[PDB]
């Protein structure tokens, strides 16, 4: 059929030219039913037409069409556990979005797509319904009603084919979980393929690190319940007999470094095969070949196994590649942070040969700051150069600083409140400013802190701090005296070994003392400082302004921060007053902790802690009684009331502030007092020595599935505190508090784990050696921050 003209009926958005173009048929050509059908199918395939009809009028080829209504909006109702924006992102990734049209036959398809998304997020009983609201001008809105349903949780994780290790002991090291008590923070009970693969790798490693070279995971099975609210996992394995490590043999283009390697491949012939050690050998060889310039030194380890004698022999293939040089290092995504903040963390220098280990070190260092959510690397090449590359770090900035508030309870500090506002990246500079405050039963503390972590390129820091501190003693199991102090401090920090860290700084502190109970150990200092207050009254005030030089050293080698199993921590702090200050004294403290394991799985440990301290005056003066040392409590010596170990107060005969019988008073004249007066309330001492030997064991009655999160210990604690300036000749009848032989011992049990309320630590101790005046407190616990 010859066509002399073309006409359309229904073209609203698509122009007439677009239609005339897409059509195989054009004006002035012969047409048949086949070409008409082709045109109709093309119009349908354009994705903008719902119904098409190409008929023949008297002379004209008339095209009727009902354009698919243009989508004007996409609403949602019932996306509790799914964000509207993410759902819309998934939708517009599927194809449907605003501006486009609505295919009136793909409704169930989109419903099933969203259902599949829900199936992927965990929910399997979800129902999606797409309602369609027509509107004039051939527009339509698409509403999506979601019935989420109830999530599916794991009810069991089983492992079959294991005979040497119980299944619980293996699940204990998984990221998935089947049991989640209400008194522990061990994880959720959800299912994800990534976690499953990670757990399979953890299992494979747990076996390969024990000699089971032939270990093989036959298959995995995931199953549901007919109600689709429970998930079951099954893992079949085949653990083969243990294998020994007979020897090692290297071969490849070692680059003449065959000498420096054979010392890295030294073993005791007849060792138990292990995968971690093999990977460590490979990484060491790679680090060496990087030290010699090579950037991509491939290393492969192939084991030749012999079952007749059960001997493994490793075959290491080394392929040291070519040297690559770095021309640039770029950072994109740092809209707030400056380039220096990201560059000073790079261990790979621009303008030098390349090392991938250094690039990874830089990436990790950038991850630690906390200013970036994601950190990706890309080593692009250079157009027209086979030995040059440009490194790129893509970063996504995060909300830098936080508003932190937290509570806790405990026997020592009663109820403890904390509140602070912190900022870690002040205008993208690295400065960390903050305002913090704490409040407990016996002190308020408020500090304003600032610090530049790079006052020098190497990593030296420079701090700064203003602080206000109110301290009541009667609330701390001591003699009565109130100290309100304010001051400022500045300190530098020098890192030297990646474990050791020195620090040195200056400080000014103003102290005001008031509401002081007459007792000898106070006068011994007041007199020294020229004062001559009275004994028969406690309206006594004393102000001092002191300048101090503070020094310190720290050593940290613990394998872990939480529940360590091997290493040692050490801290030395010191202070000395420099001339000009009213007070003349020096003070020193030394804390030490040492964890020593006695097994291979690190479940039996021997912990040893010590705490030494000594201070004294210089110009015939004494040390301030508000800088003294205190022992007793859940940190030094357990089983004793906090801050009761050591010297006691020797009161004077003195009227009281306001007398009211039925209240216990400490030797007031209004009760028949005419001479000095022993007491049982502590005052502290200028010298202190504390030790603790603890034995950590596994929790015996709790399931092995999550018994690795609870720490059980049996401890033996010792301590003593004493005053060196107590003149035992003048005050004869009362004991000699300058005798360090008065050692206080205790022994008992302790538990420690993590709870939603916060960290928990319980302890029951029974002091068997204690002296007159020491108050016992067997049960002690510290739910929360402190």
């Amino acid at each position: 059929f010859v066509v002399k003209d073309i006409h359309f009926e229904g073209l609203q958005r698509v122009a007439v030219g677009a239609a005339l173009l897409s059509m195989p048929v054009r004006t002035g050509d012969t047409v048949n039913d086949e070409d008409i059908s082709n045109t109709i199918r093309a119009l349908f395939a354009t994705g903008n037409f719902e119904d098409v009809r190409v008929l023949r009028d008297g002379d004209t080829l008339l095209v009727q069409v009902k354009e698919r209504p243009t989508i004007a909006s996409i609403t949602f109702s019932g996306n509790k556990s799914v964000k509207d924006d993410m759902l819309k992102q998934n939708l517009e990734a599927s194809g449907v979005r605003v501006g486009e049209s609505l295919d009136r036959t793909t409704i169930a398809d989109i419903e099933k797509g969203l259902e599949d998304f829900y199936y992927s997020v965990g929910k399997y009983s979800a129902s999606v319904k797409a309602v369609v609201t027509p509107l004039p001008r051939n527009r339509v809105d698409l509403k999506l009603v979601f019935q989420e349903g109830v999530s599916a949780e794991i009810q069991q994780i089983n492992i079959v084919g294991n005979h040497a290790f119980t299944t619980d002991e293996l699940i204990s090291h998984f990221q998935l979980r089947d049991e989640v008590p209400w008194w522990n923070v061990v994880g959720d009970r959800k299912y994800q393929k990534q976690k499953l693969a990670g757990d399979l790798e953890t299992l494979r490693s747990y076996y390969l690190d024990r000699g089971y070279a032939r270990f093989n995971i036959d298959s995995t099975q995931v199953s549901l319940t007919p109600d689709k609210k429970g998930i079951y996992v099954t893992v079949n394995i085949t653990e083969g007999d243990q294998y020994k490590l007979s020897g090692v043999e290297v071969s490849g283009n070692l680059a003449g470094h065959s000498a420096e390697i054979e010392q890295l491949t030294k073993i005791e012939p007849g060792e138990l095969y292990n995968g971690t050690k093999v990977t460590k050998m490979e990484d060491d060889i790679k680090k060496l070949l990087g030290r010699y310039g090579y950037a991509y030194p491939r290393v492969q380890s192939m084991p030749e196994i012999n079952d007749a004698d059960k001997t493994v022999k490793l075959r290491v293939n080394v392929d040291a590649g070519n040297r690559f040089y770095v021309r640039k290092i770029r950072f994109e995504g740092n809209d707030t942070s400056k380039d220096a903040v990201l560059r000073r963390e790079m261990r790979q220098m621009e303008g030098a040969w390349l090392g991938s280990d250094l690039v990874d070190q830089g990436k990790e260092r950038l991850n630690r700051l906390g200013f970036f959510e994601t950190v990706d690397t890309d080593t692009q090449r250079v157009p027209g150069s086979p030995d040059q590359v440009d490194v790129v770090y893509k970063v996504k900035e995060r909300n830098t600083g936080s508003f932190n508030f937290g509570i806790g309870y405990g026997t020592e500090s009663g109820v403890s409140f904390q509140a602070g506002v912190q900022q870690d990246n002040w205008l993208g500079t690295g400065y960390a400013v903050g305002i913090n405050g704490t409040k407990n039963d016996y002190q308020t503390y408020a500090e304003l802190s600032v610090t530049n972590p790079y006052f020098t390129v190497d990593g030296v820091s420079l701090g700064g701090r203003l602080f206000y501190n109110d301290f009541q003693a009667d609330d701390a199991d001591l003699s009565d005296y109130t100290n309100k102090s304010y001051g400022t401090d500045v300190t530098l920090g020098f890192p030297i070994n990646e474990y050791n860290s020195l620090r040195a700084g200056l400080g000014y502190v103003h102290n005001s003392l008031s509401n002081m109970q007459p007792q000898v150990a106070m006068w011994r200092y007041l007199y020294s400082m020229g004062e001559h207050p009275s004994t028969s009254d406690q309206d006594n005030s004393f102000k001092t302004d002191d300048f101090t030089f503070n020094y310190g050293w720290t050593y940290n080698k613990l394998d872990r921060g939480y529940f360590p199993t091997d290493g040692s921590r050490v801290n030395l702090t010191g202070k000395v007053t420099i001339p000009g200050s009213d007070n003349e004294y020096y003070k020193v403290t030394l804390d030490t902790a040492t964890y020593v394991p006695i097994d291979d799985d690190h479940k039996w440990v021997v912990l040893g802690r010590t705490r030494w301290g000594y201070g004294d005056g210089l110009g015939g003066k004494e040390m301030p009684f508000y800088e003294n040392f205190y022992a007793g409590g859940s940190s030094t010596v357990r089983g004793f009331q906090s801050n009761t170990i050591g010297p006691k107060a020797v009161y004077f005969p003195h009227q009281a502030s306001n007398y009211d019988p039925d209240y216990d008073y400490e030797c007031a004249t209004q009760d028949g007092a005419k001479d000095l007066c022993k007491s049982d309330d502590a005052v502290g001492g200028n010298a202190m020595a504390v030790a603790s030997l603890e034995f950590i064991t596994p929790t015996p009655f709790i399931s092995d599935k999550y018994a690795n999160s609870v720490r059980t210990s049996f401890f033996w604690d010792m301590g003593t505190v004493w005053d060196t300036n107590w003149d035992s000749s003048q005050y004869s009848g009362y004991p000699d508090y300058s005798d360090p032989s008065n050692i206080r011992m205790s022994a008992g049990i302790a538990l420690q784990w993590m709870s939603p309320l916060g960290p928990l630590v319980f302890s029951y101790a029974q002091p068997f050696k204690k002296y007159d005046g020491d108050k016992a407190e067997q049960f002690q616990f510290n739910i929360g921050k402190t």
Binding site: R398, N399, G401, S402, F403, N404, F405, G406, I407, G408, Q418, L757, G758, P759, G784, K785
Partner: peptide, 10 residues
């Protein structure tokens, strides 16, 4: 440990 009631990265 320190913030057992809200570390709020504002």
């Amino acid at each position: 440990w320190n913030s057992n009631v809200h570390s709020y990265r504002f």
